[PDB]
Amino acid sequence: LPHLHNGWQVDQAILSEEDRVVVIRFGHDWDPTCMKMDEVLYSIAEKVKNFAVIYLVDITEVPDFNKMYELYDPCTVMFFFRNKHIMIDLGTGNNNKINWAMEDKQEMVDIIETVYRGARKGRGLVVSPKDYS
Amino acid sequence: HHHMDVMWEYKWENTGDAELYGPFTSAQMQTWVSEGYFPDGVYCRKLDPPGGQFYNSKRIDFDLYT
Amino acid sequence: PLFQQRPYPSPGAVLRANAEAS
């Protein structure tokens, strides 16, 4: 899975897609939660490839977003679409990021696909098929 | 145009014995929602792929698939 | 509802804001 290595690269990545969701994982490869998440993101990448591209960002090597994206969870996954952060209601109370090892591969595809169809349709907000409380 | 369009099936209660209803188009499902047929929601899913869990339709936006 | 979570800015805008802060 591709990595972004500085702020400029992250900006380039977001600006590189017209018709796909850019999924970013902020964290650390050596981190346990990020390993679980990275496993899932890896195995579903082929499937989401017409509507989604995934990148990893280490938030020590690339600290630029730590304060504003509030990256205080070990593993954060966030969604972008034509340069707009897209939100998902996960029934968690936090609509800006998925911040846990979301173990179910098919569920991740569903969420990523929902975000894509929503963001294309113009919503800045969609809800995950499953409630996660 | 290569794939069969998205198709839905539901049940009224989320169990293994409950009765399955399908298949319906996304616009069919969306009609039934915006007309009161599922006030307390139903447990529905997409038929493709056939390995699927059921989701409460209240959390589903069918107008995304139409 | 009242006081709904707002979306974070884009990476470009974040980076620009950091530049502003300096």
Side-chain angles (χ1 to χ4, degrees):
Chain A
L1 271 170
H3 284 58
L4 306 176
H5 295 274
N6 55 46
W8 179 87
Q9 298 179 8
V10 175
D11 196 33
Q12 290 299 124
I14 264 56
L15 258 15
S16 69
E17 296 299 338
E18 278 305 322
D19 299 75
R20 294 198 290 168
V21 171
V22 182
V23 168
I24 303 291
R25 199 283 277 104
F26 294 99
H28 294 317
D29 298 350
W30 69 80
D31 172 83
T33 316
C34 298
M35 262 164 176
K36 293 186 173 180
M37 193 66 237
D38 286 348
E39 201 107 336
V40 167
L41 295 165
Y42 176 57
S43 67
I44 74 164
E46 237 284 87
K47 214 215 291 281
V48 311
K49 85 165 174 173
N50 252 260
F51 59 93
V53 56
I54 308 185
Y55 297 103
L56 312 192
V57 176
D58 179 297
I59 57 160
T60 277
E61 168 200 23
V62 190
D64 314 44
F65 301 100
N66 290 0
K67 190 177 178 187
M68 272 249 226
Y69 291 173
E70 320 204 270
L71 307 177
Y72 313 138
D73 321 281
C75 182
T76 298
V77 174
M78 297 172 47
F79 300 96
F80 300 86
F81 190 81
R82 311 186 189 202
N83 203 27
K84 291 154 90 292
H85 176 221
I86 308 287
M87 312 178 72
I88 359 174
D89 188 323
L90 306 156
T92 56
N94 202 334
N95 288 347
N96 289 340
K97 45 167 81 192
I98 291 175
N99 57 350
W100 72 96
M102 222 279 94
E103 305 283 23
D104 196 324
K105 294 173 187 182
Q106 185 49 53
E107 277 170 25
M108 191 54 56
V109 179
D110 298 349
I111 282 161
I112 298 188
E113 208 198 344
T114 306
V115 171
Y116 167 60
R117 294 178 161 278
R120 204 188 104 81
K121 276 301 184 50
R123 332 268 217 256
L125 174 67
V126 295
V127 8
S128 55
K130 181 162 191 151
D131 173 273
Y132 292 88
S133 43
Chain B
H1 200 129
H2 296 212
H3 270 95
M4 159 109 217
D5 25 319
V6 157
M7 225 69 186
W8 304 93
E9 68 175 14
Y10 64 83
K11 54 184 166 191
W12 286 95
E13 248 124 35
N14 204 28
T15 69
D17 339 86
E19 301 239 326
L20 266 191
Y21 294 75
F24 313 100
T25 44
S26 283
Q28 179 65 257
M29 299 289 305
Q30 181 56 48
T31 280
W32 287 331
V33 162
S34 76
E35 271 171 9
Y37 286 80
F38 309 117
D40 286 345
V42 280
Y43 302 95
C44 70
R45 76 184 171 186
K46 281 174 292 269
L47 283 160
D48 180 37
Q53 75 194 248
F54 287 96
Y55 294 131
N56 189 303
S57 31
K58 290 160 92 84
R59 312 188 52 93
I60 312 293
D61 178 352
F62 297 103
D63 226 54
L64 280 182
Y65 289 93
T66 67
Chain C
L2 254 212
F3 306 140
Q4 303 197 123
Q5 199 162 16
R6 234 106 161 286
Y8 294 151
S10 65
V14 177
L15 288 168
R16 178 209 257 94
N18 294 350
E20 264 136 36
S22 26

